[PDB]
Amino acid sequence: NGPMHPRPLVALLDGRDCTVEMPILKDVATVAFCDAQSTQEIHEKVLNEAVGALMYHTITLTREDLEKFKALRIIVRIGSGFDNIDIKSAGDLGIAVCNVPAASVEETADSTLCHILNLYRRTTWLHQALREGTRVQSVEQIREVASGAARIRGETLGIIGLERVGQAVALRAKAFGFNVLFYDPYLSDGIERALGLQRVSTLQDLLFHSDCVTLHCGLNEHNHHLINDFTVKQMRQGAFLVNTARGGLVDEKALAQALKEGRIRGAALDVHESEPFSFSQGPLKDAPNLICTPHAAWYSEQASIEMREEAAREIRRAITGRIPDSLKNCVNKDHLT
């Protein structure tokens, strides 16, 4: 029961476009966007009054940031992952946090397969070479310039985390002749049978046996820097690494090192946990055999529209309905006061 009323304020924290949200929110909320990179860039009014918040992945919200909001009831994340939010302490303050789990599931799995195929077939590097003036003529040169393209069939793809994307990735994999096995601790027993996938129990198990390792794992306390000096050594000689999950899962220091030494034949990263920049600054400087996309595995126009509208509705359900009942996609029911 804080400060003020008429019709409640809902702020887009790390963006400046609400044109998709506007027809859903118009009548029930006062729309304003703070285009803020951090909590400092969000104006005074907003912290003191914001009833609901909409946000993407650009801004991290910590207990410190959360303590500052005075009338905050809900924070809705436009997208799946909410590691950029302290969900524990957010509920400990009474703010329910939600997400959009579904929108870009297949878009992500497609970029993933793209990445896997781009390492195995060298399509991207081969094009980049052609751009950069390389000059392929004889068959000998074809074999040379495309040196170490591989036959996929028989190859073992190890998937880490078979919640959502993990699944779609796997199914697709199958059709390419990939030997598909996975590691996921939080998933219940049985699923691997229903899906006809091999499951291993330990992490080093998958590392040991996969020719290609992809990440599709939520980011939390434990799995931070899951790939590092110790675990990276448990991988195969010249095993490919794909990461379109979160960035904090891979010690870029250890990966950059391992790429140069030749122990990891190539990596494809859509997520480099190291805010916007890289390739010019960061450990991955001149790391050989390393594809990079700018956090775009999720993106397609139609998926963006979709997730924006779902996020918008959650906000509406929040405002007109009741916390935490009305909410369809709440992620900290467990932590609410």
Strand order in the sheet with 9-12: 30-33, 9-12, 52-55, 74-77, 96-98
Structure-derived torsion over alpha carbons of residues 280, 284, 288, 292, reported in degrees to the nearest 10: -80
333 Cβ contact partners less than 8 Å away, ≥ 6 residues apart: 96, 324
CA distance 35 to 305: 19
Residues 131, 35: one domain?
no
Q: Are 145 and 309 in contact (CB under 8 A)?
A: no
Report in angstroms the alpha-carbon separations of 272 from 35, 78, 255.
Answer: 22, 20, 11
- Residue 276: inside a domain, yes or no? yes
CA distance 280 to 282: 7
Degrees, nearest 5: CA angle 144-148-152: 140
Give the burial class of 235: count Cβ atoms within 10 A of its Cβ; 0-12 exposed, 13-18 middle, 19 or more buried: buried
Residues 308, 282: one domain?
no
CA distance 174 to 53: 41
Give the burial class of 60: count Cβ atoms within 10 A of its Cβ; 0-12 exposed, 13-18 middle, 19 or more buried: middle
Half-sphere exposure of 135 (CA within 13 A, CB side): 1
Number of domains within the chain:
2
- Residue 2: inside a domain, yes or no? no
- Residue 45: inside a domain, yes or no? yes
**Residue span of the structural domain in which 239 resides:** 105-298
14 Cβ contact partners less than 8 Å away, ≥ 6 residues apart: 34, 35, 36, 37, 55, 56, 57, 58, 59
Q: Are 141 and 237 in contact (CB under 8 A)?
A: no
- Residue 324: inside a domain, yes or no? yes
- Residue 199, SS3? strand
Residues 86, 225: one domain?
no
CA distance 101 to 306: 11
Question: 145 — alpha (psi -120 to 50), left (phi > 0) or beta?
Answer: alpha
Measure CA 40 to chain center. 25
Residues 54, 93: one domain?
yes
CA distance 328 to 99: 9
Query: Which segments of the chain does DSSP mark as H helices, in order?
Result: 22-25, 44-49, 63-68, 87-91, 105-121, 123-131, 139-145, 166-174, 191-194, 203-209, 229-233, 252-260, 301-320
Residues 31, 159: one domain?
no
CA distance 177 to 183: 19
- Residue 61, SS3? strand
Degrees, nearest 5: CA angle 318-322-328: 60
74 Cβ contact partners less than 8 Å away, ≥ 6 residues apart: 51, 52, 53, 95, 96, 97, 98, 314, 315, 318, 323, 327
- Of 123, 148, 119, residue with least CA distance to 243: 119
- In one letter, which amino acid is 336? L
Residues 291, 321: one domain?
no
Residues 126, 113: one domain?
yes
The reply to whether omega before 324 is within 30° of 0 (cis) is yes
Residues 290, 166: one domain?
yes
CA distance 72 to 64: 14
CA distance 235 to 34: 44
- List the determination method: X-ray
- Residue 174: inside a domain, yes or no? yes
- Residue 215: inside a domain, yes or no? yes
Half-sphere exposure of 16 (CA within 13 A, CB side): 5
Report in angstroms the alpha-carbon separations of 68 from 32, 43, 197.
Answer: 18, 12, 47
Strand order in the sheet with 266-269: 198-199, 179-183, 156-160, 212-215, 240-243, 266-269, 290-292
CATH number of the domain within which 270 lies: 3.40.50.720
- Residue 115: inside a domain, yes or no? yes
Residues 314, 178: one domain?
no
Q: Are 213 and 231 in contact (CB under 8 A)?
A: no
Degrees, nearest 5: CA angle 239-242-243: 140
Active site residues: 246, 275, 295
Q: Breaks in the chain, named by the residue before each, with C–N above 2.5 Å?
A: none
Q: Are 159 and 198 in contact (CB under 8 A)?
A: no
Work out the number of other CB atoms within 10 angstroms of the CB of residue 90: 26
Residues 182, 328: one domain?
no
Residues 70, 118: one domain?
no
CA distance 24 to 135: 55
Q: Are 207 and 235 in contact (CB under 8 A)?
A: yes
Residues facing residue 11 across a β-bridge: 32, 53
CA distance 247 to 252: 9
Residues 196, 292: one domain?
yes
- Residue 1: inside a domain, yes or no? no
